[PDB]
From a paper:
Each domain comprises a parallel β-sheet linked to six short α-helices. While the β-sheet of the N-terminal domain (NTD) is comparatively extended to six strands in length, the C-terminal domain (CTD) terminates in a long α-helix, which extends across the entire molecule. Activity assays confirmed that SenB does not require a divalent metal for activity, and no density was observed for a bound ion. The apparent disorder of SenB’s interdomain cleft in the absence of a substrate (regions of missing electron density indicated by dashed lines) is analogous to that observed for substrate-free MshA, perhaps consistent with catalytically relevant conformational flexibility. To gain structural insights into substrate binding, we soaked SenB crystals with UDP or UDP-GlcNAc; however, this treatment dramatically reduced the crystal quality, in many cases causing rapid dissolution that precluded structural characterization.
Here, we report the X-ray crystal structure of SenB, the first known Se-glycosyltransferase that was recently found to be involved in the biosynthesis of the Se-containing metabolite selenoneine. SenB catalyzes C–Se bond formation using selenophosphate and an activated uridine diphosphate sugar as a Se and glycosyl donor, respectively, making it the first known selenosugar synthase and one of only four bona fide C–Se bond-forming enzymes discovered to date. SenB then uses SeP and activated nucleotide sugars as glycosyl donors to form selenosugars through the generation of a C–Se bond.
Residue numbers in the entry: 2 to 14, 19 to 88, 90 to 154, 159 to 184, 190 to 229, 234 to 287, 294 to 331
């Protein structure tokens, strides 16, 4: 067992969702609580800290390292901090103060300074599974979930302007650039902001998910039996694997269009290969696995009684 764990998520009312999911997976072995800032009024009881984002939580992190020198500090690199730690002094200070660093995919520790890697640990994110649905051989529907690399998808859709056999469904809140692409191109559609249940059903129902960004969406696709076409950036490669066959160069719309065309051609195949490759990735995103990685991390951070 019963350590008192504090999760720092300084998000304004991504990281909140992770924080809540970690609290639920750790609640069986610890008294877990989420805060925006530490310390608070219940802070004298806390023994272990899991702070999300080396910069946004730096002030909590620094407060923890003063009250608990060499004890209980886990700092989670959520993305933009890892890819901040180049110039940000606070981000850098957070890396040095931590007893443990958490990266969320395999490749994270390569961006970490050399002296910070031994204390890094890989904890893949997790999501619930959806059943893999049968898919038509007569079209290829691609879904992209991403608040408005928007231009990369936009350019690929214009390079495919006449095709109605390749359909691109863009989900996300922004805008007129999207509405224009929707009027001009039969196969592009901007559905705007959609509820979370509808977004996951469309991903489950899509032949493929396209991610051009430089993470939860990729897990939701993989765990719903939907392959992914993704930009070759470390965050994505860490999720899908160094030998994944569905990568496109970041900012290369022609390469993205070619990849959709190749998926379409093998219908009736690259798409079948991508499906097989994603099914081998899916067990990395099992809640059981994330929970187990968290248990071990908590046993490592747990400080001996003062
Ligand atoms: Na508990």
């Amino acid at each position: 067992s019963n350590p008192s764990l504090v999760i720092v998520s300084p998000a304004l009312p991504g990281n909140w969702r992770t924080a809540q999911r970690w609290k639920a997976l750790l609640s069986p072995v610890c008294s877990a609580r989420v805060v925006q800032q530490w310390p608070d009024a219940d802070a004298s009881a806390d023994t272990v800290m899991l702070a999300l984002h080396a910069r946004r939580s730096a002030e909590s992190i620094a407060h923890w390292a003063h009250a608990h020198p060499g004890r209980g500090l886990g700092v989670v690199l959520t993305g933009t901090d890892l890819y901040d730690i180049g110039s940000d002094p606070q981000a850098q200070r957070s890396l040095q103060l931590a007893q443990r660093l958490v990266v969320l995919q395999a490749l994270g520790a390569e961006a970490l300074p050399p002296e910070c890697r031994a204390k890094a640990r890989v904890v893949y994110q997790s999501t619930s599974a959806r059943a893999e649905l049968p898919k038509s051989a007569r079209q290829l529907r691609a879904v992209m979930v991403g608040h408005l690399s928007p231009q990369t998808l936009f350019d690929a859709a214009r390079l495919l302007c006449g095709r109605e056999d390749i359909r691109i469904d863009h989900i996300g809140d922004a805008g007129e650039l999207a509405r224009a692409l929707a009027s001009d191109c039969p196969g592009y559609r901007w559905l705007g902001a959609l509820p979370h249940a509808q977004t996951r059903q469309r991903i489950q129902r899509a032949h493929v998910l396209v991610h051009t960004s430089a993470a939860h969406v990729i897990m939701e696709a993989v765990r719903s039996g939907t392959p992914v076409l993704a930009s070759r950036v470390p965050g994505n490669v860490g999720m899908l694997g160094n030998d994944y066959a569905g990568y496109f160069p970041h900012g290369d719309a022609a390469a993205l269009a070619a990849l959709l065309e190749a998926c379409r051609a093998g219908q009736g195949g690259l798409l079948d290969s991508l499906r097989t490759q994603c099914a081998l990735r899916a067990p990395l995103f099992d809640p059981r696995a994330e929970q187990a990685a968290l248990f071990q991390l908590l046993n490592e951070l747990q400080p001996p009684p003062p």
